[PDB]
Subunit: 354 residues, 4 copies
Amino acid sequence: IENSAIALSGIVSVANNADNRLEVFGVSTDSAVWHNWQTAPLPNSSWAGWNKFNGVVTSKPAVHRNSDGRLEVFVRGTDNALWHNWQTAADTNTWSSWQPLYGGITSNPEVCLNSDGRLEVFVRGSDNALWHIWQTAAHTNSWSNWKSLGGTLTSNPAAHLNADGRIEVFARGADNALWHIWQTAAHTDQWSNWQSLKSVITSDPVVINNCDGRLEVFARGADSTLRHISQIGSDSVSWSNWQCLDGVITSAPAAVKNISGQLEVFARGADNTLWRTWQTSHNGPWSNWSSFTGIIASAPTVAKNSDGRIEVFVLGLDKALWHLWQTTSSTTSSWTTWALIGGITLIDASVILE
Amino acid sequence: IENSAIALSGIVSVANNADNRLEVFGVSTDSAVWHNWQTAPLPNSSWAGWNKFNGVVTSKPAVHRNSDGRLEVFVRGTDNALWHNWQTAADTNTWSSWQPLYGGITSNPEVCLNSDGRLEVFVRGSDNALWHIWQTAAHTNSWSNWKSLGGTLTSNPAAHLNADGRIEVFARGADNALWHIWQTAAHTDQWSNWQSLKSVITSDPVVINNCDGRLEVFARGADSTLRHISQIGSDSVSWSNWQCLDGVITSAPAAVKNISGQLEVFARGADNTLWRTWQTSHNGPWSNWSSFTGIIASAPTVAKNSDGRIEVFVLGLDKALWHLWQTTSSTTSSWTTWALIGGITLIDASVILE
Amino acid sequence: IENSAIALSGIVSVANNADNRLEVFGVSTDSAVWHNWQTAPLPNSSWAGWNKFNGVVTSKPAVHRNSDGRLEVFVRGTDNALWHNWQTAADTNTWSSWQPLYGGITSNPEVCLNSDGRLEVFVRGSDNALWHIWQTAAHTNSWSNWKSLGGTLTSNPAAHLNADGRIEVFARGADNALWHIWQTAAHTDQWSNWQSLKSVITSDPVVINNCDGRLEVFARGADSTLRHISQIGSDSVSWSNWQCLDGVITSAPAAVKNISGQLEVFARGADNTLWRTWQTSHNGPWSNWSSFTGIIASAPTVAKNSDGRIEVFVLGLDKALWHLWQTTSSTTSSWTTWALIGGITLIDASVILE
Amino acid sequence: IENSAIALSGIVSVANNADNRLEVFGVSTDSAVWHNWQTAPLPNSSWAGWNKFNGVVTSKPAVHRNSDGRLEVFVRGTDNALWHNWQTAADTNTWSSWQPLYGGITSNPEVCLNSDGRLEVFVRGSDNALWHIWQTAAHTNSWSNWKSLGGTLTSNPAAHLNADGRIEVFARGADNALWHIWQTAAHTDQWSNWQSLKSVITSDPVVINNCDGRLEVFARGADSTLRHISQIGSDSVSWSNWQCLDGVITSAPAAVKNISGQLEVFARGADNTLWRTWQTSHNGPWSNWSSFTGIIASAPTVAKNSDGRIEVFVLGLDKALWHLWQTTSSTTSSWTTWALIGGITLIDASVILE
Ligand SMILES: C[C@@H]1O[C@@H](O)[C@@H](O)[C@H](O)[C@@H]1O
Ligand SMILES: C[C@@H]1O[C@@H](O)[C@@H](O)[C@H](O)[C@@H]1O
Ligand SMILES: C[C@@H]1O[C@@H](O)[C@@H](O)[C@H](O)[C@@H]1O
Ligand SMILES: C[C@@H]1O[C@@H](O)[C@@H](O)[C@H](O)[C@@H]1O
Ligand SMILES: C[C@@H]1O[C@@H](O)[C@@H](O)[C@H](O)[C@@H]1O
Ligand SMILES: C[C@@H]1O[C@@H](O)[C@@H](O)[C@H](O)[C@@H]1O
Ligand SMILES: C[C@@H]1O[C@@H](O)[C@@H](O)[C@H](O)[C@@H]1O
Ligand SMILES: C[C@@H]1O[C@@H](O)[C@@H](O)[C@H](O)[C@@H]1O
Ligand SMILES: C[C@@H]1O[C@@H](O)[C@@H](O)[C@H](O)[C@@H]1O
Ligand SMILES: C[C@@H]1O[C@@H](O)[C@@H](O)[C@H](O)[C@@H]1O
Ligand SMILES: C[C@@H]1O[C@@H](O)[C@@H](O)[C@H](O)[C@@H]1O
Ligand SMILES: C[C@@H]1O[C@@H](O)[C@@H](O)[C@H](O)[C@@H]1O
């Protein structure tokens, strides 16, 4: 792989509804977003079946739950602008049409919830800088003007809240290194400058918070293995050294914090099957990768059910969506084998960043 | 103190709105619930001023945020039944009138959110058993019938979600020991029998979840000191031994999990000032109690702001509400001194359980 | 129990030889010290049988391994002075006679090894102060003069090295509180003043080091339950709050750090059987006490074998020594039932401090 | 670097005496072992000056403290056999002549102390297998016959005790991977088969025990960065995945467990200066490498003083020994700059394994 490669992404975006039912969003062969959902937040739930949103789109969709429980989806349109739609009531299948947010965008959109309940969206813009736009009142359709955060991006952005409520954004730069930028006061328009975390990454960055409030970042490296880095925490502005984990991976990674407070990462492996690794104790070392049966055609997208069971979605070789999950809440739970969520096929609509 | 004492309670119930603004609920000299709130989730926010809900009540009010962001308050009425009111839209001061849930209740109400978005309320009933009633659809005014969980209670109930989504309820029994009962499957009407955690407690029990998903319970003991116990976790049905902490306390305790993932407890001390103790490292031993200046006339009620700053409310010697808070997000932050939230005086409306 | 009670002590002192074989020292009905030992450091080792040291003694004996591997025993004599004897070669049954160290002593002796290889002995003296005497060259019979550390003691002293090589000594004071005093530079004659850790204790204090270098102290409290306190560590001069553990105990406690780095404490319980409690995770909460079958007539004395198996010695109702042990090295090992180390009976020679 | 490279080794072997004074052993331009030592275990100690052992040698020397405190040194002779010498009394400069242990050896010797006080030495033999010989009685000159443990080695062996007293040996195999072999019962002649830990390493392996009893292994990898792996512990036979740490290193690493229970590693860096990294919390992530001033000409050899201060020895550009150290016991201590231990120059006598 080249230093400038971006590993194969997830084929859906997933959210929990207000009632915690899982719901997935992908793009079909008609270049439209479709969605499907659990009918009940139970281990044996049926799924509703695929439902279409009319309108042609030109990126992967990003979904987030508002602070009033309503799901809202962001996508690039045929005009290269940002568009969004939403549930008009939490847990209900009454959606708005696609509505315009304008701008000129050149990445998939990334959405985060501020600590004061306002959604905020981050994209690469026409000048390759990071741009952003936000709700100006929590869970309301009153949006700011577009504003630039500068930089030169070569991946999609990834955003996460610090434990103190400050949004921090990670993105690969022109030197193929991981860069980041952050709010310097919680949920305020006061941002740092861009700083480098060095290294080279060959996927979009993925970020998660540990129990103790430290952000941890995962990405594929130049040698095609998973690597990770973390905030050293307490008063400090610093981060750890980077570490690689052995095992060649062939997609973006997806990270989750299990019921027990420990980190787990999923990725397509060198043999094109799903691999999983977990921290074996607190902060701990990481397990050898474990494989699930079956060749997969996207990165995993990982979610947690209402009862904390982990569930993983992928593109199959039939170009449909498949999933598997933990059968019980224990971190030692058994797993199911891949099952089909049939009715449509999906395409990878991700923006070709080059 | 007698084994059957119940330490002085908090004078308000507090919640975060959908936008994370703090809002408090107490009962004034007119025996009505009044509320007040931060106008913005900022460290220097003004407060709106006290607003009254018409109607005479006969318990402490309990508030919880619905899964759609709307606050909802529960209280006993003049008819000894349960009543409730709610924001009709998240973050807005448009409330319903008090509406009936019926029943016959003999404690303050305790409200919990299931892991599937449905509110559930626990009370002592006319027969001294634990009773419960719940939303049958998330964030909707469709409520179940009343149902009994048996037992014989001598404190108010305290409810908390396990990390796997099962509600567990703690209450003092007829032998003055801590008892508990739990959902055996997440957000389902399938409950355990009552089991004893032994000991004797002389306050309502207070419960919190640690980072690693273990519940921990705090209460005042027979010797008037704080004591605590925790789930041993992983696969186990067991709990730890009890431990006491030195230092005589003179109110119910209030527990909070700080930004760093560590536990802190607040309580009125032997000298009638606010005391605080914290875990000095992970799981760790506990700090000696630290005091804040000023005599206080209730237990503390503790909350966290949108940026993780801890804030504490108490009844003053003037019978008004006072508060203090961390000036910044660090666990080493300085604290303010008590400041008045003036405009009304409060009474302790707690149900006299004897 | 009275605040000034001192719980029943262990009936033997135990050490590991240079080869790690266990060896025990007690006083028989002839008021002489006798000893016995494992013939091999193996789980099924035979014991040599009881061997007598000629000479009448008037305290419990204290043993320590020199920095050259030779065991050395300290005891009060018929003249109320300190006496000592030693192996003349490591792992060999060629002992010196009792030889004089003089002084006037009014407690059992306590021996510690400095971090520079010199033995040091702490006693209560004729004026009730703490006194000490030491080897002036490692593992040599060149001893200092006696020197006073002041104070007013009401228990035997207990000494332990800090992780940085400074000896620290714990003893109950005239107010029945735990006091302590320490070297302010490693293995140097530069000591702090006495400081109080407050509380009241009703046993000799017992001290151990945790993995992370923090000392932890265990003692029975005024309410006859185990209590404990620890250094908060890093740069700090401070200690934690005290915690009690439920369960009435009826002897001194004995603490051990298992193979896994976790603390375990043993004590005679309220029913006069051996009880055990362990930290269930790192720093963690403590397990409920677990009992072994059989009424015992002393506190436990606890040791670890060459392979880390824990072994516990007690006085039986026949007035002989009994022991039990872990059958394998795991912290989940099964335990044997009490077995007799027959051939003599023992008396409790502890100095009656009142 | 090639997969079969073995990074530059330490220029001395170091031990603590019975009194904890540091003492170093190297080979000079006369192909003889010389040694030097602290005269007192103090932060400002003078060093005695270089003293020669007569006799020409043909490997790096290995030293270990016996269970009776006497230092003992192992080296290959001009006849390719193993030879050894020892202090005839702990802490004294009265040494034996070199005495024969015979055999045919083709690596540097590695010495370990069993948990029953017997020294054991591991070498590569004439057939490239691992061979061993041991004291048959603790701290005695009664040695076993030579015995083979098989395998095919391409590095020097590294031995360490498990927490349960079982010796485990690590060595690079014919495939350049890390292999290991272990006692299956403590201090017994009952060994496992060889098993692979996979990976490729380009230095001798270095092993240390964590607080919690898990062995951790450090080595340079194929990409010239530090990598490490650990036992997953409790009941398990398994190890973690390998992790690399960023930063190109140019010598063997040296690992130490500080006062606080945390791991630190030292290595010559890409700029030929001494680099250091530490675990920033428990098990934690690792700090970015920190550099000390000055170009160095060997790997570091790391030791701890009687008071826990870390001290590091290296070969200078003048071909003499230099050292630096922590000025106080805190893990935040300042460090000195390199100072000369003058009087001789040293050569790297390591056996050329190819
Ligand atoms: C998502 C939107 O879909 C339709 O609504 C188009 O008219 C827009 O340009 C956009 O593609
Ligand atoms: C998202 C942003 O869209 C508009 O406001 C442009 O002027 C910017 O360059 C950026 O493309
Ligand atoms: C991910 C799925 O894996 C197996 O179940 C295959 O049979 C499917 O086509 C799909 O690739
Ligand atoms: C809270 C309610 O307040 C009024 O609405 C009364 O009519 C009810 O009995 C109840 O007290
Ligand atoms: C809350 C409950 O109220 C009614 O349904 C009563 O019949 C019960 O006894 C209990 O008091
Ligand atoms: C809690 C407050 O503490 C001090 O500030 C007093 O002056 C007030 O009356 C009040 O008791
Ligand atoms: C331990 C010693 O035993 C004998 O050697 C006596 O003569 C001494 O006074 C002392 O009791
Ligand atoms: C151990 C000490 O013995 C002597 O040196 C006495 O003068 C002291 O009072 C103390 O008793
Ligand atoms: C400690 C031992 O416990 C039981 O085994 C009794 O039969 C013995 O007499 C002794 O008390
Ligand atoms: C270390 C030994 O040194 C001398 O004693 C030689 O005679 C031996 O062959 C060996 O080299
Ligand atoms: C150390 C060993 O030395 C002898 O006993 C040889 O026969 C072996 O091959 C090995 O070299
Ligand atoms: C390790 C030492 O580093 C510097 O102090 C140089 O001046 C020396 O020659 C030596 O290389």
